[PDB]
């Protein structure tokens, strides 16, 4: 008969985001953070209050 | 320098519907959002809602979300205001007016006031 056990281990999931390293690029990780806005929306807007003068 | 030509004075049988227009002159129509305002008889002021001519973009009131339907032809640069099924309550003067610069601006140009009468 087999005795008891006990394991230490870590998380795992299904996540594909992928960060670089110094070592080695795209290394898949659990969890990310991304840092970069790529994004913007076309427009000349009011700032704070304020519309520009357009000319 | 800026004027906002607005529609003559209507009257209007109860239940029915009016088209008031609102003629820009002076600056770019596409630049300004326009607006319009109601005031019921020597009393106090109301919002209606805006309209943006370049892309046609409208911005309500919760009152009057319904009843308002604003439009505008870029063509004519001309703003268009459209009142459904009035009563008593909707007799009052309107004002065609250029708000400054969008959700957090000023009314700097008020237009002349197309007054409307609701009786059969």
């Known amino acids: 008969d087999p005795g008891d056990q006990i394991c230490i281990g870590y998380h795992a999931n299904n996540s594909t985001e992928q960060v670089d390293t110094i070592m080695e690029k795209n290394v898949t990780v659990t969890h990310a953070q991304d840092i970069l806005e790529k994004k913007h929306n076309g427009k000349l807007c009011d700032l704070d209050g304020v519309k520009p003068l357009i000319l | 320098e800026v004027h906002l030509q607005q529609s003559g004075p209507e009257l209007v049988k109860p239940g029915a519907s009016v088209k008031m227009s609102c003629k820009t002159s002076?600056?770019?129509?596409?630049?300004?959002?326009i607006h319009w305002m109601k005031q019921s008889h020597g009393k106090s002021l109301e919002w209606i809602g805006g309209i943006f001519p370049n892309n046609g973009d409208t911005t309500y009131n919760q009152k009057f979300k319904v009843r308002a339907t604003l439009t505008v032809g870029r063509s004519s640069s001309t703003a268009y205001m459209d009142l459904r099924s009035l009563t008593s309550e909707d007799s009052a003067v309107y004002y065609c007016?250029?708000?400054?610069?969008?959700?957090?601006?000023?009314?700097?140009?008020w237009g002349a006031g197309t007054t409307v009468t609701v009786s059969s």
């Open positions: 002076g600056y770019t129509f596409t630049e300004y959002t």
């Open positions: 007016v250029r708000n400054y610069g969008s959700s957090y601006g000023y009314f700097d140009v």
